[PDB]
Design a binder for this molecule. Structure first.
Ligand SMILES: Nc1ncnc2c1ncn2[C@@H]1O[C@H](COP(=O)(O)OP(=O)(O)O)[C@@H](O)[C@H]1O
Ligand SMILES: Nc1ncnc2c1ncn2[C@@H]1O[C@H](COP(=O)(O)OP(=O)(O)O)[C@@H](O)[C@H]1O
Ligand SMILES: Nc1ncnc2c1ncn2[C@@H]1O[C@H](COP(=O)(O)OP(=O)(O)O)[C@@H](O)[C@H]1O
Ligand SMILES: Nc1ncnc2c1ncn2[C@@H]1O[C@H](COP(=O)(O)OP(=O)(O)O)[C@@H](O)[C@H]1O
Ligand SMILES: N[C@@H](CC(=O)O)C(=O)O
Ligand SMILES: N[C@@H](CC(=O)O)C(=O)O
Ligand SMILES: N[C@@H](CC(=O)O)C(=O)O
Ligand SMILES: N[C@@H](CC(=O)O)C(=O)O
Ligand SMILES: [Mg+2]
Ligand SMILES: [Mg+2]
Ligand SMILES: [Mg+2]
Ligand SMILES: [Mg+2]
Lengths: 464, 464, 464, 464
């Protein structure tokens, strides 16, 4: 049983979709049980995000119409360039048209109301995958193989209703997909969406298509989960930032999970857990260079000589420094800080506390800064005094660099190497986290020093 | 207005008490408003701690009697060697005898019940200072100066009733002490004790006499708070561990507060806050070398060349690693972790979190390990799962080293220097905290590598 | 300064609106500072409620169009019958048309989404007052007086964003209205709506127009708040249930507040507080019989001979009986009951507890029953046992009768009279509340005995 | 299986103890399985209460010695007058002497410490039953029957450690007592005491000996629980207040439980629950008139003609009126009121709320008033305002009268009868509770009108 997932750029045009369909069809000959997971076409999810905000804010009906036509012409051209059979094009075009009708109605409905609830957002975003999957399914049929397009929910992914980033409650992947596989059918499952208990469409978070593939793999006790993307596996760092980056042939579950979590976009962080806990390997491959061995992610762990195996970054973060009111009890005031932040669903990436004043340093998701300040003000309001917090500063022009490798925590002398290197790059360290991870050290520097810092780190540990 | 505080060893014998009385009496000529704060005689607080536990556990009435006689003979010999006037000795001996009566009754009562409540503990411990203060007060009278002995509460220190480490509620230091100063009297205020709203005797935590001095300073809007101890101020590290340690002439409030907080015993950490918030300078001096300039603690801040100005350690700590259950939300699970720890009054010194598994690293007070595990088990009990925690390990054979200096957080390259140094000492770093403090970097290593690590750090940054 | 509020029926047609405009214009000659508060036209708020639910549930676009036309024709006919000047009709019709456009877009938007958030509800409801106020303002101009129509928010009523029943945060009534009054302008402020800090339209709860008048009165330090309705003041009971009901010329703030609170619809319960705390009198008058003295509500308090001065009822309630698990501590289990109910925003009208089993009796708002049971089940789940609750029963076929009068609590023998009377009416008492109010005794009986009970109570105490 | 409990007065002298031993020995012939539960001798528990407070406060060692001798002479005289056999007297006198030794040591231990913890209180109180039980056991042996004295804990009553009123966790009554019964032994179990998991002596609350009997009955699946006291069953009211009171032959569990709960001292309220839930009947009998049929408490329920079957009072209560801050939400503020009161373990007997100001009326245990105010002040501190509470008044000169009977809640017209009757007695009603109980109506009047009110109530409903 092989589940194969294809990203945005991998299906960025009709030609590429056909190319993908060929890849899938070749696997069908090696393993007869093949399930496909497909993302929205290149750049459409972003367009759906921004039209959602436009329909809400400016409320221009003709700007919606402009959008619909951009979507129509992108997917029409895709159908035309991916499928040869006229009968099949005609079949796929109809499905696409039903989707565009619904999309149009909902965007107009949003404009008419001037309201865009989290539920409506998810519905709108799901159209990306619901428009691309039938085109790929059709192209697979066009190559003489049986295929139907399915949505995440009907493929067996049931979530709660925390729209925007629903968490998985329940799987019925066997129940939904096994009958189809038995008939020899290749299901093309929509990437980043699932369903509520009552059938409401739900998204799993940006980059969530990867996670879908892992869920389906998990559900089906698959032999392998294949991640097909636009680079040949997981590299020593992001090859679009540092072009001398090198493919890492083998990586462990925890190494990959930490990298993904800390900014190696190639994998959504939630991809690893389901595969990890059933020992299903993950093979990351390049659709544009399908001959490459890529990266195999399993249980096996090997330490590297220089120890640091890879470097990831997150640009979209803010450093929040909470200033405590003195010797007021760190666990007590941390209890209240994280209750407030947790209530507001603020996503904290990093914590450090080591201060006689009960100060604490946090890294949050940058877009969560306003929710965070609002939450802290609600909780604390405004030395003999009973007060716990004194003030709070934010720095948004900041980033998190992480360094990941097999024996990181245990490796004598590596911290000093990493930090002298950081210094020599011209960066000033604002925060360090070490201790909570077997394989990871993260730190915070100014956003402007990102590129230079990553390069120096790459030079010292990977290139030599 | 000058408040002068004298430590345990400073009054470790009658001869030393007389010497201290001379020091005070010489200040009386420079400033007419002098208040003394005095600790229990050398080693008696410890003896009181251990007799409390013996009276509770083994319940031996004659072992209590052995203790009383040790206390009687230590303080009798002190009266005899500190005071010349027979009339005054006879006067001080009576006060001491009233105290010994009460001490004896309470220890026997403890043995009879087999119960030692936090309230009873504090009462027993307070005897140290309540036995030493009248001896010093009598020695000050013996030198022809007016003096009476006071207890913390009646000197105006009012606390809550969290026995063991009561926090200050309210000050009436002006109201209680001003009338006495106006009459030209030198009050000898007992060190580490205060009073509940209803007059129950309360202790301010071990090493609390320093804090009393700061409180009385704060209350009286004093010109200076003098800490008289057995070393000539604050040193680059603990001079009893690394004898090449150097006196630091000048230190800022925050620098001193972090060092104290992180194990420079010379100052209780709570000493700084009251002095800091009123800009009252703190002068640390050696009673055994009273000519030394010592250390002046004020607002002034000067960066050092090598940046690290001092090194402190805490031996009595444990590393607690809580293992999370995956991608379960760090602020949500941190809210529950610290709620539980905060409820159990567990004292956490250090936090670090940087882990896709939602692991967190904490440093706690070592004696608090059992309270901590009990609290975590109560809170969490025992990936589609809803569980937040997976497991929790403790390592007690561990210490915290801190490095303190004016421009620490901002100083380019210092982390790398510190950590390469740590490595070269043969130490393995288990945890790092950096970011939450302007002047401090703390890390955790094995207990066995403490001495070697401090030496190497001292060599590189202080000696060169 | 006079604020005059006019209810639904008072402006139930164009003819009535003109009649109201005349009333206002006559006041303008007695006091030059007049502010008007106006409800939605008779029956339209109810129509807006029900179209909201239809647009959500059935989602029929033509049923929305039917509604729009009903609204259009009601308000067009009103403009035509209230205003003589063609130029003014033309001016008011345009404002009405802008409102109907917005109304239509929003209802369609609701139907397209199948979502009706509390925010959307409030926006939709607000159209009642936003459609009636400009018609009244135009009629006031038609009589040669200066007037403009304002919305609650822009008139200075700022609320939180608890949509459905927003509570007032802040008033800027002076700042917004004083400039307009200085120019001699009569502002016609929309009744039951206010605004969020960010300008989101908000409602104050059903019957809220009364409360708006009191707020505006409070904000302006008005000399009088006039409530113009369809009865001549506050009567001994609801004159539509018991036609022998008598006008009460004078009533105290607390007497009126209890009656309103307990079902005398003539005043929203929140009307009294702002007027009470600034000692601004409330004059309740009949728009259809404007010569009647009505009811004056002030600080003055006079006891009546028979003590009971008035009877109110609430039909829309449920009796909830929580059965406790024995001697489990009433305050402890009450703490948990009311936490759960408070969290779910369940409105409890009455409490009684006097039971060895820790049973408690509550009266809630009937529509809140489901929220209540859901909250209790969440809190308690399912004699040596630790459990606090045993079971819980509901009775919806039930009502609350209250009896209000100046010296009620203190009056010897009145409870016995009230209850023998209740008995003789054929009613069976399920709950009694007495003690917490100076002027009120409330009890619970079967819904079917309401009419008979009120009559007997009215006969004995009012008619004799 | 018959458990027989004997109260304080029932064993108020040696003569009475022998008389009780005869009663037991006569039952032994009708049922071979007899367990005895015995209270402390008349008036000694009270003496132990007051000596506990004296030893703590004044700390007079000779006042303790006076007490010991009073206890010694009371129990010596008892041994002498209850037992004939010299060998047995000698045997029982030794047990008594071991108890007096322990008692003496503990009281002196308290004086020496000046501390009386809840744990020490319970230990001291338990001596009453621990001194009386061996005397009764010896008297039972003196009549040629086998008997040993046991303590509550070792008889199988295991509690938590909430000293003063520990609640039962666990029963091992079968395990401890069955072996003894099989040997034909009559165990004399101490009344109102149990044991902690770790063997710490614990009391079940004043009047708890009744509850012990019920627990032992429950544990043993007894056929009957017999309550032997100084009146012939449960009367229509307290026969020492109203001498025309009449024995009620038959009463249901719930009727008896409400009466006990509301002041019919004859039964501790907790007696009913264990007997009720296993359908074990309770027979209340007079030891001084052992031929009377007394009162049988079972499941059977019969309505009386006049409906009110009995009247109970609690003198030791206070009325607390919390004044709310207006329309601030009753369940929300009730949540916070009862949280605070529940935390402080304040015992609330009665609740009533029916007020537009969010006032609430409570009845608490009078000794709990200070705890209650301290709790409310801690929770709330000190109309646009956010505040929930306005003020709070207490009235200690107040009592609760309850009226109990089979069909109370359902009975048409009874409330009116009760309350006109109350009025005619000259009482003024401050609070009414009705609704939460099937069989009970409670109200609050001035303490001074208690006697007169009870009389009038008794006259109208019982005597006619
Ligand atoms: N360590 C890394 N190894 C490989 N690719 C990385 C790494 N870090 C970041 N990337 C980026 O991830 C991109 C592929 O991920 P993504 O944009 O999500 O495509 P897909 O549509 O397949 O999800 C690559 O273009 C690369 O720039
Ligand atoms: N940085 C430091 N400088 C000086 N002394 C230190 C430092 N760190 C720890 N100490 C220890 O603090 C001691 C003085 O404090 P303490 O033992 O509490 O005596 P006191 O009774 O005067 O408080 C010295 O003996 C010294 O060894
Ligand atoms: N005790 C009472 N006295 C007078 N009117 C009452 C009383 N109780 C209820 N009402 C009802 O309140 C109605 C007026 O209030 P309402 O229906 O809100 O109209 P509006 O608020 O629009 O003027 C009257 O028609 C009357 O039946
Ligand atoms: N309703 C009632 N019926 C009978 N006795 C009552 C009632 N209410 C109170 N009592 C009192 O209860 C007393 C017996 O109980 P108590 O004083 O607890 O003695 P014991 O030691 O037997 O428990 C009687 O002396 C009587 O005055
Ligand atoms: N199409 C979604 C999901 C994915 O890319 O995997 C996104 O833009 O994030
Ligand atoms: N005497 C106390 C307090 C102090 O010395 O400051 C102790 O030994 O901790
Ligand atoms: N709009 C209000 C009318 C009023 O308050 O008079 C309602 O219908 O509840
Ligand atoms: N010693 C107990 C005996 C009893 O249950 O009455 C008491 O006085 O409360
Ligand atoms: Mg991706
Ligand atoms: Mg010290
Ligand atoms: Mg109304
Ligand atoms: Mg009793």
């Amino acid at each position: 049983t092989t589940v194969m997932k294809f990203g945005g750029t991998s299906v960025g045009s009709g030609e590429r979709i056909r190319h993908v369909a060929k890849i899938v069809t070749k696997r069908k000959k090696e393993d007869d049980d093949v399930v496909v997971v497909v993302s929205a076409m290149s750049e459409v999810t972003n367009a759906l995000v921004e039209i959602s905000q436009q329909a809400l804010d400016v409320r221009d009906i003709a700007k919606v119409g402009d959008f619909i036509k951009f979507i129509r012409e992108k997917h029409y051209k895709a159908i035309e360039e991916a499928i040869k059979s006229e009968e099949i094009k005609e079949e796929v075009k109809k499905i696409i048209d039903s989707r565009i009708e619904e999309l149009e109605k909902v965007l107009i409905g949003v404009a008419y109301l001037g309201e865009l609830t989290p539920k409506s957002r998810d519905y709108i975003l799901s159209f990306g995958e619901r428009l691309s999957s039938p085109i790929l399914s059709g192209a697979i049929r066009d190559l003489g193989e049986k295929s139907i397009a399915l949505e995440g929910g009907e493929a067996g992914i049931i979530t709660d209703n925390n729209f925007g980033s629903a968490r998985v409650k329940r799987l019925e992947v066997k129940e939904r997909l096994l009958p189809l596989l038995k008939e020899g059918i290749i299901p093309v499952v929509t990437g980043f969406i699932g369903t509520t208990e009552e059938g409401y469409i739900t998204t799993l978070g940006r980059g969530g298509s990867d996670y879908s593939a892992a869920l389906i793999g998990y559900g089906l006790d698959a032999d392998i989960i294949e991640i097909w993307t636009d680079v040949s596996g997981v590299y020593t760092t992001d090859p679009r930032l540092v072009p001398t980056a090198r493919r890492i042939p083998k990586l462990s579950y925890i190494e990959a999970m930490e990298l993904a979590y800390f900014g190696a976009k190639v994998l959504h962080p939630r991809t690893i857990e389901p595969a990890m806990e059933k020992g299903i390997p993950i093979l990351v491959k390049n659709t544009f260079e399908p001959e490459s061995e890529g990266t195999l992610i399993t249980n096996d762990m090997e330490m590297s000589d220089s120890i640091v195996k890879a470097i990831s970054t997150i640009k979209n973060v803010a450093l929040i420094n909470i200033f405590g009111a003195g010797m007021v009890g760190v666990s007590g005031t941390a209890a209240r800080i994280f209750k407030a932040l947790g209530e507001e669903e603020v996503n904290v990436i990093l914590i450090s506390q080591g201060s006689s004043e009960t100060n604490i340093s946090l890294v949050v998701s940058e877009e969560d800064v306003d929710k965070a300040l609002k939450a802290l003000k609600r909780e604390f309001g405004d030395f003999l005094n009973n007060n716990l917090i004194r003030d709070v500063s934010v720095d948004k022009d900041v980033c998190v660099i992480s360094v990941v490798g097999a024996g990181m925590r245990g490796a004598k002398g590596i911290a000093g190497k990493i930090f002298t290197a950081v210094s020599e790059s011209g960066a000033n360290i604002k925060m360090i986290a070490q201790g909570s991870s077997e394989v990871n050290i993260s730190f915070v520097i100014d956003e402007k020093d990102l590129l230079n810092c990553v390069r120096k780190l790459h030079e010292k540990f990977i290139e030599k």
